[PDB]
């Protein structure tokens, strides 16, 4: 435990990027799924986020129709922190995925003002995990 911050006072960024999220209009969403070409930001932030909400996706065109819905954003703030899902995913995401540079507050927030929240939001869940991991069984010190 580098930090004595966990789920509870976590970081606001957890609830600043659901906040943010649902800030999003459908505006704000409809040009980035207009978008024929994303910059290095928008599609690898929404690859991260499927892979959080348990989906598999990873194609440009593939995506847009997911977040062509009004209600893309709503799910990605009603995520439960618990779940069956496979956690050990985030792991999977750093390989080189989250390497990229294009992955930051700045890159991201600059292609898009929908996409900055974003890449807090799927920056949140990993450092919730954090928490979730100490608290867990097995591995303790």
Same mark, same amino acid.
Request: hydrophobic share 35%; proline share 5%; glycine share 4%.
């Given at each position: 435990? *580098?930090?004595?911050?966990?789920?509870?006072?976590?970081?606001?960024?957890?609830?600043?990027?659901?906040?943010?999220?649902? @800030?999003?209009?459908?505006?704000?969403?409809?040009?980035?799924?207009?978008?024929? @070409?994303?910059?290095?930001?928008?599609?690898?932030?929404?690859?991260?986020?499927?892979?959080?909400?348990? %989906?598999?996706?990873?194609?440009?065109?593939?995506?847009?129709?997911?977040? !062509?819905?009004?209600?893309?954003?709503? @799910?990605?703030?009603? %995520?439960?922190?618990?779940?069956?899902?496979?956690?050990?995913? !985030?792991? %999977?995401?750093?390989?080189?995925?989250? *390497?990229?540079?294009?992955?930051? %507050?700045?890159?991201?927030?600059? $292609? *898009?003002?929908?996409?900055?929240?974003?890449?807090?939001?799927? @920056? $949140?869940?990993?450092?919730?995990?954090?928490?979730?991991?100490?608290?867990?069984?097995?591995?303790?010190?």
């Amino acid at each position: 435990g *580098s930090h004595m911050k966990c789920i509870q006072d976590i970081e606001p960024t957890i609830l600043e990027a659901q906040r943010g999220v649902k @800030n999003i209009k459908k505006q704000q969403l409809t040009e980035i799924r207009s978008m024929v @070409n994303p910059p290095s930001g928008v599609k690898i932030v929404m690859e991260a986020v499927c892979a959080i909400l348990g %989906y598999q996706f990873s194609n440009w065109r593939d995506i847009q129709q997911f977040i !062509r819905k009004d209600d893309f954003i709503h @799910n990605i703030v009603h %995520y439960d922190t618990t779940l069956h899902m496979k956690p050990q995913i !985030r792991k %999977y995401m750093e390989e080189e995925f989250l *390497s990229d540079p294009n992955f930051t %507050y700045e890159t991201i927030n600059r $292609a *898009s003002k929908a996409c900055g929240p974003l890449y807090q939001w799927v @920056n $949140a869940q990993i450092n919730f995990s954090k928490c979730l991991e100490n608290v867990d069984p097995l591995r303790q010190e």
